[PDB]
C-alpha cells in the first residue's frame, strides 16, 4: 500500500509539497517565481537561454525532485508559448532541456508539465493549523497575472482531495468480497458514493475562482502540449537530449488517478476497446507518477466488484453500487456544463469544440452504461 504513495488525507496529491530548492538551484527558482513579470516584459526567453546547465544530483529526495519538475515544467511552458499569442519556440535550450529530461527520466514522467506537477505538487497551506480549504491555500507557481491558475489548480486539487476520502475504503471493499462480508461491502460502497457525492459540491467553486475569458484565452494556452498540435506539429526539440523533436500531450485531468481509479474499481471499462477516448485515457497513465500507475494496474488485477454485486440477487448491494456509478455520472455531467461555460462560449466570442464535447460525452455515456438498474 505504501508503495502506492497514497496519502490518508490528500490521496494522490503530494502531502505538504516542498517550496524551496537547495541554493544550488536558485537560478531556476528565480525564473519560475517571477514568470508573470518575466514573460510579460519579454525577459523570460533570454534568461532561459542564458542559464548554465545545473546538475540534477543535488536534488536528493522525492519532494525536492517533484518541486524541481514543477519549476522546470512551468519554465518550459513559458519558454515554448512565450506571451501566449502564438509565437512559439520549437527548441528547448540544452541547458534546461538536459537536466529536465534527466530528472523526468529518474521520476519516470515525461519532460512536459503534467497534472501531478501543476496540481498535485503545486500547493501549500497559508496557515499550517487551519484545514485544507481554499481560503487557507495557495499555489506555488502561476504563469501570468490574472491567469486564474490559483482557482484552477486549487479547485482541481480540492476535488482530488475530496475523492481521497473514498480511496482508503478500497481495501475494505476487496476484503469484504473475499471474506463474504455482505454488510461490510454494502457499507463500504455507500461510503464511496458519499465521498464522490461530496466531491461534486467542491467542484462548484470553479465558478467563484476562475473566469471564462482568462481561462480560455490565457491558462489553456500555457497548459497546452505538443502532441497532435499544429503549432508544433513534430513536437519539441529537447536540445542535447534527443536528436529528433518529441511529442507529449499537455497537462490534463485525464492524468488524475482519482477518476481513473474509480472507473477501474467499479468495472466501468473506460479504457476498453480501440476508440479515441479509451486510448487517450490509457495513454494518460504514462503521465502519472509510476507509483500511481502501479496502483491502477493492481486495481485492474483484483476480482471484479461489479461481477460480485451482479451475482448476489441483493437489491441493497445493487443500489449501493449504482449510487457509486451515479456519483461519477453527476460529476461528469456537471463537468460538461463547466466545459460549455469555460470553453465553448468563450471560443464562440473570439474574433474543435465538438470533438472535445464528444470525448467527454463518450466517457460520461460509458459511465452511465454501467448502471445495473436504469439510475
Ligand atoms: C474551467 C474548468 C475546467 C475545464 C474547462 C475543463 C476542461 C476539460 C477538457 C477540455 C477535458 C478533456 C481532456 C483534455 O483536453 O485534456 C477535460 C477532461 C477531464 N476533466 Fe476537466 N475541465 C475543468 C475542470 C476540471 C476539474 C476541476 C476537474 C477535477 C479534477 C476536472 C476533471 C476532468 C477529468 C477527470 C477529465 C477526464 C475525462 C473524465 O474522466 O470524465 N476538470 N476537462
Ligand atoms: C491542471 C488542472 C486541471 C486540468 C484539467 C481539468 N480538466 C482537464 N484537465 C489540467 C491541468
Amino acid at each position: 500500500s505504501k508503495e502506492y504513495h497514497i496519502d490518508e488525507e490528500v490521496g494522490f496529491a503530494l502531502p505538504n509539497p516542498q517550496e524551496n530548492l537547495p541554493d544550488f538551484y536558485n537560478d531556476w527558482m528565480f525564473i519560475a517565481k517571477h514568470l508573470p513579470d518575466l514573460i510579460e516584459s519579454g525577459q523570460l526567453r533570454e534568461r532561459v537561454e542564458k542559464l548554465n546547465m545545473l546538475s540534477i544530483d543535488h536534488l536528493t529526495d522525492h519532494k525536492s525532485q517533484r518541486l524541481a519538475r514543477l519549476v522546470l515544467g512551468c519554465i518550459t511552458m513559458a519558454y515554448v508559448w512565450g506571451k501566449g499569442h502564438g509565437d512559439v519556440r520549437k527548441v528547448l535550450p540544452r541547458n534546461i532541456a538536459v537536466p529536465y529530461c534527466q530528472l523526468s527520466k529518474k521520476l519516470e514522467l515525461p519532460p512536459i508539465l503534467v497534472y501531478a506537477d501543476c496540481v498535485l505538487a503545486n500547493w501549500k497551506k497559508k496557515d499550517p493549523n487551519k484545514p485544507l480549504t481554499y481560503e487557507n491555500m495557495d499555489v506555488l507557481f502561476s504563469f501570468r497575472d490574472g491567469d486564474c491558475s490559483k482557482g484552477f489548480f486549487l479547485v482541481s486539487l480540492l476535488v482530488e482531495i475530496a475523492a481521497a476520502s473514498a480511496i482508503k475504503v478500497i481495501p475494505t471493499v476487496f476484503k469484504a468480497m473475499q471474506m463474504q462480508e455482505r454488510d461490510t461491502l454494502l457499507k463500504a460502497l455507500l461510503e464511496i458514493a458519499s465521498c464522490l457525492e461530496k466531491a461534486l459540491q467542491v467542484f462548484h467553486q470553479i465558478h467563484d475562482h476562475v473566469n471564462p475569458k482568462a481561462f480560455f484565452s490565457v491558462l489553456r494556452i500555457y497548459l497546452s502540449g505538443w502532441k497532435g498540435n499544429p503549432q508544433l506539429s513534430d513536437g519539441l526539440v529537447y536540445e542535447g537530449f534527443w536528436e529528433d523533436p518529441k511529442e507529449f500531450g499537455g497537462g490534463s485531468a485525464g492524468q488524475s488517478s482519482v477518476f481513473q481509479c474509480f472507473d477501474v474499481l467499479l468495472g466501468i471499462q473506460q479504457t476498453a476497446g480501440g476508440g479515441h477516448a479509451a486510448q487517450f485515457l490509457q495513454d494518460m497513465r504514462r503521465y502519472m507518477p509510476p507509483a500511481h500507475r502501479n496502483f491502477l494496474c493492481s486495481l485492474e488485477s483484483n476480482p471484479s466488484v461489479r461481477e460480485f454485486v451482479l451475482s448476489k440477487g441483493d437489491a441493497g448491494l445493487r443500489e449501493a453500487y449504482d449510487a457509486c456509478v451515479k456519483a461519477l455520472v453527476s460529476l461528469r455531467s456537471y463537468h460538461l456544463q463547466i466545459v460549455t461555460k469555460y470553453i465553448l462560449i468563450p471560443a464562440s466570442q473570439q474574433p474543435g469544440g465538438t470533438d472535445l464535447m464528444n470525448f467527454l460525452k463518450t466517457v460520461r455515456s460509458t459511465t452511465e452504461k454501467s448502471l445495473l438498474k436504469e439510475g
Side-chain angles (χ1 to χ4, degrees), residues 31-327:
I31 301 173
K33 276 294 179 181
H34 296 101
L35 290 180
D37 179 54
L38 297 171
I39 286 171
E40 209 244 64
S41 62
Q43 297 173 80
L44 182 282
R45 286 173 163 174
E46 194 174 59
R47 308 284 284 258
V48 166
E49 292 151 3
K50 251 50 162 160
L51 286 159
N52 300 322
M53 190 181 294
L54 302 185
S55 176
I56 70 173
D57 300 341
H58 316 288
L59 295 177
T60 53
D61 57 29
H62 188 72
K63 292 207 192 172
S64 80
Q65 296 154 19
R66 284 286 298 278
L67 165 63
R69 262 191 64 86
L70 174 56
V71 159
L72 290 180
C74 291
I75 295 171
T76 294
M77 298 309 223
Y79 187 87
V80 177
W81 306 122
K83 302 185 189 182
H85 307 301
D87 181 83
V88 320
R89 277 291 210 270
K90 299 145 174 314
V91 174
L92 186 64
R94 75 191 336 106
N95 284 0
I96 190 163
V98 168
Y100 183 29
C101 285
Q102 310 167 316
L103 174 65
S104 291
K105 194 189 184 222
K106 183 157 171 183
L107 286 183
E108 305 172 76
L109 286 167
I112 188 161
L113 187 73
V114 306
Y115 184 82
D117 306 319
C118 62
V119 177
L120 298 190
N122 182 24
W123 64 277
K124 61 169 185 156
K125 271 174 180 205
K126 271 173 189 170
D127 178 356
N129 318 299
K130 277 134 158 174
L132 289 161
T133 190
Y134 185 84
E135 296 67 27
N136 189 39
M137 293 167 86
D138 222 316
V139 297
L140 307 179
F141 299 99
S142 288
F143 297 104
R144 309 293 303 268
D145 292 327
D147 68 6
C148 291
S149 52
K150 185 191 171 178
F152 188 71
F153 293 154
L154 297 186
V155 172
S156 295
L157 179 72
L158 280 171
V159 173
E160 190 71 44
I161 293 162
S165 314
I167 294 154
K168 72 204 199 235
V169 183
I170 293 169
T172 305
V173 169
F174 289 122
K175 182 98 320 165
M177 276 158 63
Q178 97 151 341
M179 294 320 179
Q180 292 290 336
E181 289 294 316
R182 173 277 187 191
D183 302 328
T184 303
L185 183 53
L186 172 64
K187 184 190 174 156
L189 297 172
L190 294 168
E191 173 60 26
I192 290 163
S194 182
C195 296
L196 287 181
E197 278 160 17
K198 292 186 172 141
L200 172 57
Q201 310 301 318
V202 184
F203 238 108
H204 293 21
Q205 294 173 98
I206 201 82
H207 301 284
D208 299 323
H209 307 303
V210 183
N211 141 283
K213 172 172 184 174
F215 173 78
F216 179 75
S217 73
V218 188
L219 197 41
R220 175 183 63 93
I221 295 314
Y222 284 99
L223 299 168
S224 299
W226 23 102
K227 180 161 156 83
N229 188 336
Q231 299 195 313
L232 286 181
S233 62
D234 301 312
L236 185 62
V237 178
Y238 291 83
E239 195 177 47
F241 198 88
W242 300 295
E243 63 307 306
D244 294 321
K246 307 294 169 191
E247 284 195 290
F248 293 102
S252 177
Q255 303 163 347
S256 165
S257 309
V258 154
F259 286 78
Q260 291 227 23
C261 116
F262 294 106
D263 284 339
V264 173
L265 187 69
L266 300 168
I268 287 159
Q269 272 172 352
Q270 243 8 304
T271 61
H276 179 261
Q279 291 191 117
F280 167 71
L281 293 170
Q282 185 63 31
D283 192 38
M284 295 303 105
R285 295 169 176 202
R286 301 172 89 147
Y287 292 68
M288 300 173 180
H292 297 168
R293 88 176 77 112
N294 292 350
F295 182 62
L296 297 180
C297 168
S298 77
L299 292 176
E300 311 269 20
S301 307
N302 287 109
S304 163
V305 178
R306 179 184 172 79
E307 280 323 295
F308 186 104
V309 176
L310 261 165
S311 73
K312 295 305 175 285
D314 181 330
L317 272 180
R318 284 201 315 272
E319 277 148 28
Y321 172 92
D322 271 6
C324 293
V325 174
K326 222 283 274 274

